[PDB]
Amino acid sequence: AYTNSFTRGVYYPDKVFRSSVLHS
Amino acid sequence: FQPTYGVGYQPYRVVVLSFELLHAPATVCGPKKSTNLVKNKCVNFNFNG
Numbered sequence: 320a321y322t323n324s325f326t327r328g329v330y331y332p333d334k335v336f337r338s339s340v341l342h343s
Numbered sequence: 344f345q346p347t348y349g350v351g352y353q354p355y356r357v358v359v360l361s362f363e364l365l366h367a368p369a370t371v372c373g374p375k376k377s378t379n380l381v382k383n384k385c386v387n388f389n390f391n392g
């Protein structure tokens with residue numbers, strides 16, 4: 320059986336705080 | 344290991360201290376004292392190193 324992930328499974332990549340920014 | 348062995352073949356105890364020096368809260372620190380905080384003024388500072 321299968322289903323679609325869509326956009327699931329993003330996580331905070333490091334223990335830093337950031338705001339209003341398009342981080343890569 | 345026998346105490347008669349040549350220096351390279353003698354046992355050595357090894358300890359490796361591995362640091363997670365992360366951008367994350369501290370739980371191990373060096374012997375630093377701490378001051379009161381100061382606000383709205385130009386200060387030299389040190390938080391967690």
Ligand SMILES: *[C@@H]1O[C@H](CO)[C@@H](O)[C@H](O)[C@H]1NC(C)=O
Nearest residue numbers: 320321322323324325326327
């Ligand atoms: C992917 O999921 C769909 C869900 O309808 C399925 O039909 C398809 O066989 C699956 N393909 C692979 C390669 O898993």
